[PDB]
């Protein structure tokens, strides 16, 4: 029954806080920077390294202010939290591609209304 396409999740996960690829990338980078110092400390595991090299290959923007701006310009809408992560991470070119990938956008909003958002997201990319 758990299918994110139809916007259903368990009660515990419904009150969660969405994270973007750049956000988690910078959080892990800062954690690595803190952990590398302060000698006599248990070094990072393979999980941390794999997550780092996985999120580093999808960092659409390095500046934290870019993350703040893209989340601020998106939260003003009426979309759910789940729609804040996938759409801001994939960064589709045209509204048709976004509507095809995410079935929730089908009929939820107009075509130009989503195309302008996608163009803004593309321009915000570094």
């Amino acid at each position: 029954e758990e299918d994110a396409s139809q916007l259903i999740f368990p009660k515990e996960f419904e009150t969660a806080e969405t994270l973007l690829n750049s956000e988690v990338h910078m959080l892990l980078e800062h954690r690595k920077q803190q952990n590398e110092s302060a000698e006599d400390e248990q070094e990072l595991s393979e999980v941390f390294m794999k997550t780092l090299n996985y999120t580093a290959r999808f960092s659409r923007f390095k500046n934290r202010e870019t993350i703040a701006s893209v989340r601020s310009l998106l939260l003003q809408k009426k979309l759910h939290k789940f729609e804040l992560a996938c759409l801001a991470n994939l960064c589709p070119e045209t509204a048709e591609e976004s509507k095809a990938l995410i079935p929730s956008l089908e009929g939820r909003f107009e075509d130009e209304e989503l195309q302008q958002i996608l163009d803004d997201i593309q321009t915000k990319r570094s």
Partner: protein
Amino acid sequence: MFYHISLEHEILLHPRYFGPNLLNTVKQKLFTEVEGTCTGKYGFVIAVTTIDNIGAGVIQPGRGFVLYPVKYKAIVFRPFKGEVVDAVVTQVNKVGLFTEIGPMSCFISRHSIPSEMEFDPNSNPPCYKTMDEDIVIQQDDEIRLKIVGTRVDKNDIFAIGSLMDDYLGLV
């Protein structure tokens, strides 16, 4: 898909750890307990960012071990069905494709792949192309997919991908 939620956990601390570094020892024990593990309820945990507070240690009767129900603010990665993410292809085999969604590796079979994407066993690098050889997909490429299923192999998550929907390839 990564999230930032508030979790709770309790750890017993042996009385040998009492002293001026009690809180530091509790934090160190917490760090090396709830990083990298996985559960069927919240999913796979990446790491811990910060700790909210330290509970009141209730010393057990007849035992020097004392438990601290600490509540930590850590991140978690619990992908669901139907989500679309961008991963990287690790290996190409005739049985199927191999990818790596962060702390996960999914897998797509040839049946999911359309018939246009044939095999290239003659070439040294295992790769799939079309008749015109215009589009090329190989390893170390940011190829998208759709999570159509989930599985937890005793705190080892392993989902399954799919390549039926349009606009799934090079961006």
